[PDB]
Symmetry: C2
Subunit: 138 residues, 2 copies
């Protein structure tokens, strides 16, 4: 269903951020697409990630490496998501949101970030194909 899809895509999005918040690398890894998830040259299922102000990370290794690092370097992170919009088309879903981030590596510093997350439908649930996050600059 449409309503169901939107809801399940939302839950997948929440999980992704919750996994960061609790420093749960195993879950986080599980939430990202693998070509096996797809049942695998046109690089079907190949993932990427842009962290705020970063160049592009490609493939599970660079991507998961960066999250393992981030988590290993952060003592405290909370995401307060707003303006969340979901678009589901076929077996792909597009989520945009504002990431209002508070972190501590330590004094709490806030970031205003916007993200586009792309999800893919798999038997094991909606999986991340791409995360692109960027600063909102004045």
């Amino acid at each position: 269903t449409p309503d169901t899809d939107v809801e399940q895509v939302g839950l997948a999005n929440t999980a992704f951020y919750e996994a960061m918040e609790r420093g749960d690398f195993e879950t986080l890894s599980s939430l990202w697409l693998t070509p096996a998830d797809l049942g695998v040259p046109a690089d079907a299922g190949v993932v990427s990630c842009v962290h705020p102000g970063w160049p592009v990370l490609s493939g599970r290794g660079e991507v998961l490496r960066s999250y393992a690092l981030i988590m290993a370097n952060t003592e405290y992170i909370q995401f307060f998501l707003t303006d969340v919009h979901v678009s589901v088309t076929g077996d792909t879903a597009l989520v945009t949101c504002t990431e209002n981030i508070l972190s501590g590596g330590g004094p709490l510093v806030g970031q205003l970030v916007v993200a586009t997350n792309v999800f893919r439908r798999t038997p094991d649930g909606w999986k991340l194909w791409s995360h692109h996050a960027s600063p909102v600059l004045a």
Copy 2:
């Protein structure tokens, strides 16, 4: 497959070219409409993030922004590098580096343009298979910051 990658590449190329040459009609046509999909779950609703901007949602917000950008940009060229395409079913994901060169109006009649400025930007573009070709669903661009 081998063809999909090439067609997507072509659509991605056409998108940047339209902007370069300030072709609103082509740019408009390159962005998805829900009619392209045959239209809830906001099937085929587009979004756009320009460097440093918040999110623009829906064709109206997105196209308005392109008219404005074009109107306020005397000269722009993109030089894409490190383009990568990933096709899965009816969706394609393209990441790239936008090496952007722009310029404003000149101080006077003795010059063609104002000084030129470069930007290092990276993008994730999400395309969608339609009977009329690959159409943009999302463009998200961001500065690469030191």
